[PDB]
């Protein structure tokens, strides 16, 4: 029941993208919390959230943001937990700005970066699942099933 994964996003507009991470974790029955945290607008909220994540029992944090997208990197700056970043596609630069500000983190402060957009959000949840699966046999089995279903469900020909 207690969340083991935290999904945080820069703003409400990021939900259209990050909901894909939420849906996937629920599908795999991975207890989690979904919140809005802005690195630039709510810096103290982020500091407190990241600093206390491990204490609260969180094992992985999935962070998504658009524009300069400081959220993922700054979250990683305050927590020892694995942080996965999702560049949110936002208008002018199609998430290219977000991608670079998330993936180009300096040595010492990693952010496992996923694809720009919905696919990245979905994959951040799957990656978080693969991490948790390392020490949760039941989840590992459900993940195996999920991957097997994906592979088996791909059509052989276009419609």
């Amino acid at each position: 029941s207690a969340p083991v994964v935290g999904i945080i996003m820069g703003s409400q507009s990021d939900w259209e993208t990050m909901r894909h991470a939420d849906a996937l974790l629920t599908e795999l029955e991975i207890p989690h919390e979904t919140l809005i945290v802005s690195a630039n607008r709510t810096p103290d909220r982020l500091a407190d959230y990241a600093r206390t994540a491990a204490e609260r029992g969180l094992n992985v944090i999935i962070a998504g943001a658009g524009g300069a997208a400081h959220l993922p990197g700054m979250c990683a700056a305050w927590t020892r937990l694995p942080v996965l970043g999702v560049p949110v596609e936002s208008r002018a630069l199609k998430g290219m700005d977000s991608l670079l500000s998330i993936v180009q983190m300096p040595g010492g402060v990693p952010v496992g970066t996923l694809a720009i957009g919905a696919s990245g959000a979905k994959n951040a949840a799957l990656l978080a699942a693969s991490i948790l699966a390392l020490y949760n046999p039941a989840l590992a089995a459900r993940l195996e099933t999920w991957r097997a279903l994906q592979t088996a469900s791909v059509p052989n020909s276009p419609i």
Copy 2:
């Protein structure tokens, strides 16, 4: 002494970059293996490596590649283990081709991507360490100490 992390790279040329991941894992005392495997040039070698990773005891895979970098993604296609990708800098496109080929994975097959180059390799090792630390108290302490030392070692004023 059995490896829990597997570092794979497409070529000897990628070693200059990936050695930073190897060094960091050794520093944190994380048993691991280091091999050269190319998705584009030794696809069957990759299939065998990735398919058997989990049964061989590996927990995390760190894959480095440049150009039309497919090693991380194809490894992830055959294993359920978390795969971290390191874009190796390319001559003409400065690693942009490497980066996009690795990070833009389709929904359903994740690859946690790090920065282009050495910093990326170092962070891939650190990320793998943070993953393993979730269920290894001793490593967790070694990691905490390492991170804290980094922060405390940052100078306060510039040297002219």
Copy 3:
């Protein structure tokens, strides 16, 4: 009747683009098969497809995919046959990511790359036709006719 060209694509969403390759081959009466094969979601399907292509009588393979687009390159990795790649335009990066992951293949594993989108798909089929025409006089003549009609049909002034 037996296909001499194989058109494979990463997913159903790629059909809107790859159908242009299908239509062109049919127009030129080039026997072919059109399938969905994902390098990342169905790796074994791709391995088997590419490995056996030559044995099955295929002479050319046209592969299209978006995003990281691993399909064309990995197909070329398993077959000795000429592989032509079509970067599919997909959202965030307008197929620029697909283009680089297809065209920047290492020395030793070529992928003849075409333009991003529908035009690339159409040209992949035309290129496959020009390859087959080298040893099929009847097809060569039909291709000559197709090219001649294209050139002759371009209007002299805008409407």
Copy 4:
């Protein structure tokens, strides 16, 4: 002699670039301080610096950073003072990652961004000077003289 401008940079490596801002402020006789502070590596040091900037008498902050450059933006997140950002050129992406990470700030948290590299650092100091000149007649004259000299010093014909 109390500092009215604070120049902060993520590392010693950024000094080669940021020293140009330091030199220009000194030339215009603007009291300032120069420190190394990293948003990604010393986040708490940044929080303390930015939170107390205003109460310490600072009027403008010049922040230089490269790569996933978050120093300017996070500083701006904790201070109400105007923050100017200088993108430090990066090896692979030539400062493009630095630039986008700094300029693309969300609405509500501004960072006045200057050019990539040395020219940017110089302009950050000049911009800070023009800000301070609004309420410092003496500085305003020194600035006017400086700008006028620049214009008059531009050659009229090329040397072969």
Copy 5:
């Protein structure tokens, strides 16, 4: 009543973006003028506007333009006042062209550059406010309130 900030834009099409700067200054009760000035179409108008800005009592100038966006830099070329630039997103290059022509100004002629689009326009006004706040206690307090309200109003979870 007399304007202390001047908002100038390249054309009417830039208003959709620059209106966000206008609205913000009004919200903070910062007296200002909003005008259309084209560096390339009305060079003498810009020269006169920039040259006389300080004399007219202006303290900061916010300039926005799309395309080659020469407006911000050229304005800075003629005034000693702080000039803030807003790259306007315009079609073909999503404001990337505007961004570079504004931010890459040579040493000696600065333009404090903000984000591409509406957010940049809003931030240019906020930056201008933070500059004026240095010598206007009442405004400083209103700005503090604005920033505090922004931080406090960010939702804790997505809807």
Copy 6:
């Protein structure tokens, strides 16, 4: 001994890149010719070359060019033979201008494009070889052997 592959390039400067295609064809024993022809500077020379390619016995054309690279596309405009394009790396834009000028061909006039630089030239020769191998059993065997040797020659572990 009659050439079945024609390698054309816009200039002597492109030779450093295109020589890799020449070498590979020779290695696989594929008779070919190598010439310099510029679409932008010797358009009539190109027209004559491309128009007569088929009647001269050529089966595949490998065209290398950089900058506003039009050689591959214009060659393809005059011949029905398959044309493979190699983007030659450019000084400022690192071959990006070369790549887009070559790959973005309009529907109806194909140009199979390879990687920027030497690797691209090598792959253009290999692609031409795979095309010719479809109706040349002997070449097919030589190609199979070549590809297999490449795969078997990839090292398994990195040298430090």
Copy 7:
């Protein structure tokens, strides 16, 4: 009555953009012809058009194309006349591909390149006008009037 400027474009789809060049030349009463010429689909048509342009009395050629946009450069390759190029914005790469294939011409074969899109088309016509104005006093005066009207018509404030 005899055309002194030739406007050529890669295809019918380029008309939406190139019509702006046509309209401008008509507005300035500059006799001209507007045609469709494809460098890749109708190479001989282009060769003949460019080779004979000077003989036919043309003084300037405005060429517009999208994608790889070989039209402008190849036209310049066959004529001694000044060739102005207009990159047409086309889908995947927003005319960035067209821009580079037109502007990066080798030393010895120039193409005066204008902005991507409608503005570029309009400016190509204006540039052609400024060239013709050098030896046509009446046109020079009409151009002066056009430029003066543009400058004078820019609004002072947004609506």
Copy 8:
């Protein structure tokens, strides 16, 4: 001997590039002047130069600039004469900032842009020459001869 072409550049640093335009005009015997004028740093000098160009007898202006290149565009804003722009290669962005700042002119104020760098400067001079050749038979012949010589001078085979 009165100049009919005016070559202007933002700085001495741009001369290495713009000298190629100067040399070509001299080769074709086109009287011209060469000056340094910066839009961003000597705006009034530019205004005076551009406003008086036509009355001074100039027919074409060739303007070279790098970075936030505004010289060509602002010159065009003050003169009705045709203005050709040459993007000077920049350190970090390799002339991309120069190119976009120059070519993306708004409708109504044209600037005929050439390639980034030396090739661009050479073509700007050649374009100016082709413009002047429209009403200068002698120059037209010199230009025809020059172009023809270029084409005939292109080698037919590569030197190894």
